[PDB]
Design an enzyme around this catalytic site. Sequence first.
Site, PDB file in Angstrom:
ATOM      1  N   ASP A 136     -13.926 -40.453  73.019  1.00 32.50           N
ATOM      2  CA  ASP A 136     -13.896 -38.989  72.829  1.00 32.50           C
ATOM      3  C   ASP A 136     -12.542 -38.438  72.380  1.00 32.50           C
ATOM      4  O   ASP A 136     -11.933 -37.592  73.036  1.00 32.50           O
ATOM      5  CB  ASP A 136     -14.482 -38.183  74.020  1.00 32.50           C
ATOM      6  CG  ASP A 136     -14.824 -36.721  73.630  1.00 32.50           C
ATOM      7  OD1 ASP A 136     -14.919 -36.379  72.418  1.00 32.50           O
ATOM      8  OD2 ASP A 136     -14.970 -35.881  74.538  1.00 32.50           O
ATOM      9  N   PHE A 160     -10.553 -33.481  82.546  1.00 30.45           N
ATOM     10  CA  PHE A 160      -9.654 -34.468  83.153  1.00 30.45           C
ATOM     11  C   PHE A 160     -10.010 -34.809  84.606  1.00 30.45           C
ATOM     12  O   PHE A 160      -9.268 -35.528  85.266  1.00 30.45           O
ATOM     13  CB  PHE A 160      -8.184 -34.035  83.012  1.00 30.45           C
ATOM     14  CG  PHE A 160      -7.744 -33.893  81.571  1.00 30.45           C
ATOM     15  CD1 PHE A 160      -7.462 -35.021  80.799  1.00 30.45           C
ATOM     16  CD2 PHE A 160      -7.666 -32.638  80.977  1.00 30.45           C
ATOM     17  CE1 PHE A 160      -7.091 -34.896  79.451  1.00 30.45           C
ATOM     18  CE2 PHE A 160      -7.282 -32.500  79.629  1.00 30.45           C
ATOM     19  CZ  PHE A 160      -6.994 -33.628  78.872  1.00 30.45           C
TER      20      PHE A 160
HETATM   21  C1  LIG Z   1      -5.701 -29.894  83.358  1.00 30.25           C
HETATM   22  C2  LIG Z   1      -4.217 -29.660  83.262  1.00 30.25           C
HETATM   23  N1  LIG Z   1      -3.396 -30.726  83.371  1.00 30.25           N
HETATM   24  C3  LIG Z   1      -2.056 -30.589  83.284  1.00 30.25           C
HETATM   25  N2  LIG Z   1      -1.238 -31.677  83.376  1.00 30.25           N
HETATM   26  C4  LIG Z   1      -1.656 -32.963  83.572  1.00 30.25           C
HETATM   27  N3  LIG Z   1      -0.769 -33.976  83.621  1.00 30.25           N
HETATM   28  C5  LIG Z   1      -1.331 -35.191  83.863  1.00 30.25           C
HETATM   29  C6  LIG Z   1      -2.718 -35.141  84.058  1.00 30.25           C
HETATM   30  C7  LIG Z   1      -3.723 -36.204  84.322  1.00 30.25           C
HETATM   31  O1  LIG Z   1      -4.902 -35.935  84.220  1.00 30.25           O
HETATM   32  N4  LIG Z   1      -3.293 -37.426  84.650  1.00 30.25           N
HETATM   33  C8  LIG Z   1      -4.204 -38.475  84.884  1.00 30.25           C
HETATM   34  C9  LIG Z   1      -4.505 -38.913  86.173  1.00 30.25           C
HETATM   35  C10 LIG Z   1      -3.860 -38.264  87.372  1.00 30.25           C
HETATM   36  C11 LIG Z   1      -5.390 -39.971  86.352  1.00 30.25           C
HETATM   37  C12 LIG Z   1      -5.984 -40.595  85.259  1.00 30.25           C
HETATM   38  C13 LIG Z   1      -5.687 -40.155  83.973  1.00 30.25           C
HETATM   39  C14 LIG Z   1      -4.794 -39.101  83.797  1.00 30.25           C
HETATM   40 CL1  LIG Z   1      -4.412 -38.535  82.141  1.00 30.25          CL
HETATM   41  S1  LIG Z   1      -3.328 -33.479  83.902  1.00 30.25           S
HETATM   42  C15 LIG Z   1      -1.521 -29.301  83.124  1.00 30.25           C
HETATM   43  C16 LIG Z   1      -2.391 -28.194  83.038  1.00 30.25           C
HETATM   44  N5  LIG Z   1      -1.868 -26.897  82.863  1.00 30.25           N
HETATM   45  C17 LIG Z   1      -2.709 -25.693  82.944  1.00 30.25           C
HETATM   46  C18 LIG Z   1      -2.181 -24.618  81.966  1.00 30.25           C
HETATM   47  N6  LIG Z   1      -0.708 -24.562  81.975  1.00 30.25           N
HETATM   48  C19 LIG Z   1      -0.008 -23.624  81.063  1.00 30.25           C
HETATM   49  C20 LIG Z   1       1.408 -24.113  80.680  1.00 30.25           C
HETATM   50  O2  LIG Z   1       1.643 -24.126  79.243  1.00 30.25           O
HETATM   51  C21 LIG Z   1       0.028 -25.400  82.914  1.00 30.25           C
HETATM   52  C22 LIG Z   1      -0.428 -26.817  82.604  1.00 30.25           C
HETATM   53  N7  LIG Z   1      -3.725 -28.401  83.110  1.00 30.25           N
END
Ligand SMILES: Cc1nc(Nc2ncc(C(=O)Nc3c(C)cccc3Cl)s2)cc(N2CCN(CCO)CC2)n1
EC number: 2.7.10.2
Length: 244
Positions: free
Chosen positions: A123, A18
């Site tokens: 993807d 991401f």
């Molecule tokens: C890599 C990751 N992202 C999480 N949440 C996200 N929300 C939105 C995201 C995102 O990328 N937005 C976005 C943006 C900003 C721009 C263009 C396109 C996009 Cl789609 S990433 C949570 C997470 N966790 C790690 C493990 N955990 C255990 C709990 O059960 C806590 C959660 N890890």
Amino acid sequence: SWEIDPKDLTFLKELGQFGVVKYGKWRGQYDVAIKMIKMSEDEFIEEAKVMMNLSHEKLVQLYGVCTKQRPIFIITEYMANGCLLNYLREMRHRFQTQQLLEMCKDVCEAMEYLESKQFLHRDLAARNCLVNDQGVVKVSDFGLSRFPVRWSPPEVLMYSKFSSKSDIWAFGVLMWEIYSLGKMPYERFTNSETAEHIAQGLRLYRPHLASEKVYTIMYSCWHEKADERPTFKILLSNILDVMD
Ligand SMILES: Cc1nc(Nc2ncc(C(=O)Nc3c(C)cccc3Cl)s2)cc(N2CCN(CCO)CC2)n1
């Protein structure tokens, strides 16, 4: 207009596939994910503009952008449960089959929308989906197109013939991943032997937790002839039907 004042963001923790993303707070209230460039500044900005023009319940929701200074930010809703592949593994002991079906339904709604807007995901796989605190699965519309060997149809592997129908094939594999609670497709084989066997007509066997009805849906995604695969519209109908 989509512009956010960066002064109203508080960076709380760095979060891979991401990109460079951190968890933050927007205006003291809203949990956000905040993206920065890892791609040129120009193409990051054009990505943001694609996001400004797309909107669906099952796409991760854009909140705004910061582009009137450097560094450039993209701001979305925070998906608290992270990537789908790790979430399937984390919750593997708990899921009920109805939940597995709703996850397929979520991603299928996002893809029907993107198909209708002439974007290809390219993807589509559990690693690239996100899950919110409600268990709702959503897809990213960042980096869409207008080759992961295990998620690609033969016409892609062999001819780079990308279409709606190649995303349809990948969505089938994603269904298989969901029903297999995050196992690797074609585990027995190398990428190379996978590409080989698939052209020879190898298909993924029915996961333990998939009923024959559900398997029929994922299997329809893998017709050798692309034109015999369903549309995302037809898939959603079949998924909704099997749900009741
Ligand atoms: C890599 C990751 N992202 C999480 N949440 C996200 N929300 C939105 C995201 C995102 O990328 N937005 C976005 C943006 C900003 C721009 C263009 C396109 C996009 Cl789609 S990433 C949570 C997470 N966790 C790690 C493990 N955990 C255990 C709990 O059960 C806590 C959660 N890890």
